[PDB]
Amino acid sequence: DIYKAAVEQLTEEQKNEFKAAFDIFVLGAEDGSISTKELGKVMRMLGQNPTPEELQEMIDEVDEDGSGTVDFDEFLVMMVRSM
Template sequence: MGACCSSKKRKNQGDVGEIGEDDLKGIFREFDLNGDGFIQREELRAVMQKMNQSPTEEELDAMFRSADKDNDGNIDFTEFLVIARANPISLTLRAVFDELDVDGDGYITRSELRTAFQRMGHSLSDQDIKAIYKHVDQNNDGRINFDEFCEMINRKKN
């Protein structure tokens, strides 16, 4: 998911939280793997798997049915906006994650984390980064995936 949000707030109509409609169009295009202007069920599955989600067939059907309001077997951009407005938090977290994941490989590496903090005016020592990874990198693969990132954010909120 390479869709990125800039730090500038957009004032487009249809903004979802901090995400502007242009960013939502970019996210929609990333779901639309075959580029036909629609998201089909198998594209939804592929993107969910890319985001390290493993929905059951029933969960996938439920997600797709709730989004496909006209029951044509496709989710168009308007239907996608309904999903985005219903669940802006996950899209906002995805946008933040994508901003940190500079190379777009689906992981935040130590160097990407260091760069992000430098852009915010903070300098992290190697010890600081090791401490962050010790708490966040649950599978100890040396990278932070989207699930680990979300868990870290959710722990901070609680």
């Protein structure tokens, strides 16, 4: 619940910005959630080269429903975790 705090401190504008980013990363996604596939595309689009294992790691750190995918709520937590 340490990160749950920082997400509640985010303004509606900040959340709307992340939603716009989230919305573009899920294009193609079957269920409308970031899967390792989508995450890998965003990262590579940003010049990174992650492995399947590293991608599953990033997702697992915020996968609170155990879906193996990131939904917008878990995504806001991913951003806040950065720092």
